[PDB]
Each structure stands twice: as structure tokens, then as C-alpha cells.
Design a protein around this ligand. Structure first.
Ligand SMILES: NS(=O)(=O)c1nccs1
Ligand SMILES: NS(=O)(=O)c1nccs1
Ligand SMILES: [Zn+2]
Length: 259
């Protein structure tokens, strides 16, 4: 069974041994070189349609926490931008650091942010998530950087439930959460073809990374860092530094939606 993680002994440098696609041609995350990314006037504005989102549950899965949505019909969808068709929101989660100077997966001119939010969506033309991840255009992940400054009011409900899901395998009800409160003002973005950033690292993602970070407070991110990778009663390993470093860009172009 899976035994990968973020530690010295099972972290990103080890993943290729059980997931050889780790060394593939379209791995994520990557560094976004802002001077090399080309404005593409053919890209569209994103359409983020979360008005009818139905959050259900929050789960500590031993790698991050996922806020899960009802994806049994088109309630919260992502369309437009670089995408063809309709992508349904299934879950969001974050990656973060042990200190504010690292935590993001993507970097911008080598700058690491304190954390990165991933809103994960699957292409409805493949019928279910498991089928979608087997396709090069199966997922669309909306990535949003977090910097530390003022509090993000819409994040507080998430932070306040974390005490109840401290350890791997714990979940809690998480209904009526509006993910619109996690977005920045601008939907300007970069996009490129990549992969999931956790094993099995499937090369199925169209990445859409927002240029504008959101601000969260130090206190909010400190609460992320109180979670545990371990299960209940096991030796405590704080859930920190659950980010994969930037991978080689190889034969890919990062496109900008903005001039
Ligand atoms: N990250 S991994 O699953 O390939 C692994 N490395 C050592 C033991 S298990
Ligand atoms: N961290 S991520 O959003 O690229 C992801 N991995 C698996 C499903 S979604
Ligand atoms: Zn992620």
C-alpha cells in the first residue's frame, strides 16, 4: 500500500521509486518565470461558478485536509479560461510550510509563498473522477497563493474546525461553506499542462494559477501547523511542509491571461 509522505525517508525525492511518472514530461508544480510566460490573447476569462456549491465534510487524510463537495451534479463548476467543457468541484485543500517563507508548490520567479490552495475539479465528459484522472485533460486545478498579512475572513470557518480533525483519518461535518470567500479580487492567471502534485502524480491536470495571492493572518496559518500527519495516539508529527518542490518545466509553455 501507499507509504509516501513528506519526511526525509518517504518524501518527494523517494516518490519515483513507487511512482516512476515522478520523472515524467509534465510534472507539477513548476516555477513560473513571469518574464518568460507569454500573454495569450486567445485565452478567455475564467468562469468560476460556485453559487450553488454544496460542501459536505472535511477530512484529515494524513497528507493535508480536504474540504469535500457534492459533485453528483453540476453545482460548483469551473469553465472558460484555457478549458474546454465543464469541470466539477470535488474538493479543496492546501499545502503549507513550517514557517511563512515556504509552503507553496508553485513558485513565482523562485518566490515561495506561505501556502497554496488547490480547488480540484474534474471534467464531466469522463463521467467520474476516477475516469477523469486517467486523461490528459481530466482535471482542472485552480491554484491560489497565500501570503501572511491580514486575516482572510472566509478562511476562519475552516481554521476553527481543524482542532476536531487533528489526526489522520478524522473527519467532521462541513456543510454550508462558501468557497467564494477564499478567492482574491482578480482572476488573472497563468496556465500550463501538468500533473497532480501528490502520488500517483497522474499527468491529468490543466493548471490555472491565480496571479493575485490572498492574505491570511499568521494566526490562521499557525493553526494549519497544529494538524498531525499521524493517526490518533501515534507519535506526533506536525503536518507542515506538505509541499512538493518545483519540477522541471521540460517542453512546456506557461501562458498568461493578462497583459
Ligand atoms: N515515497 S515512496 O512511496 O516511494 C517510499 N520511499 C521509501 C519507502 S516508501
Ligand atoms: N495537489 S493537487 O491539487 O495537484 C492534486 N493531487 C491529486 C488530486 S488533486
Ligand atoms: Zn494540492
Amino acid at each position: 500500500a501507499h507509504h509516501w509522505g513528506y519526511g526525509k525517508h518517504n518524501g518527494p525525492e523517494h516518490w519515483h521509486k513507487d511512482f516512476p511518472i515522478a520523472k515524467g514530461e509534465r510534472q507539477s508544480p513548476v516555477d513560473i518565470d513571469t518574464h518568460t510566460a507569454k500573454y495569450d490573447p486567445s485565452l478567455k476569462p475564467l468562469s468560476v461558478s460556485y453559487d450553488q456549491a454544496t460542501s459536505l465534510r472535511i477530512l484529515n487524510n494524513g497528507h493535508a485536509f480536504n474540504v469535500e463537495f457534492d459533485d453528483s451534479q453540476d453545482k460548483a463548476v469551473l469553465k472558460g479560461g484555457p478549458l474546454d467543457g465543464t469541470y466539477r468541484l470535488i474538493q479543496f485543500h492546501f499545502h503549507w510550510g513550517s514557517l511563512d517563507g515556504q509552503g507553496s508548490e508553485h513558485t513565482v520567479d523562485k518566490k515561495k509563498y506561505a501556502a497554496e490552495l488547490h480547488l480540484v475539479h474534474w471534467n464531466t465528459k469522463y463521467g467520474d473522477y476516477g475516469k477523469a484522472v486517467q486523461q490528459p485533460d481530466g482535471l482542472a486545478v485552480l491554484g491560489i497563493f497565500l501570503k501572511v498579512g491580514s486575516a482572510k475572513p472566509g478562511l476562519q470557518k475552516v481554521v476553527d474546525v481543524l482542532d476536531s480533525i487533528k489526526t489522520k483519518g478524522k473527519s467532521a461535518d462541513f456543510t454550508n461553506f462558501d468557497p467564494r470567500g477564499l478567492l482574491p479580487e482578480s482572476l488573472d492567471y497563468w496556465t500550463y499542462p501538468g500533473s497532480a502534485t501528490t502520488p500517483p502524480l497522474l499527468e491529468c491536470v490543466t493548471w490555472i494559477v491565480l496571479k493575485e495571492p490572498i492574505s491570511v493572518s499568521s494566526e490562521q496559518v499557525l493553526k494549519f501547523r497544529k494538524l498531525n500527519f499521524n493517526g490518533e495516539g501515534e507519535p506526533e508529527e506536525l503536518m507542515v511542509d506538505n509541499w512538493r518542490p518545483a519540477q522541471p518545466l521540460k517542453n512546456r509553455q506557461i501562458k498568461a491571461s493578462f497583459k
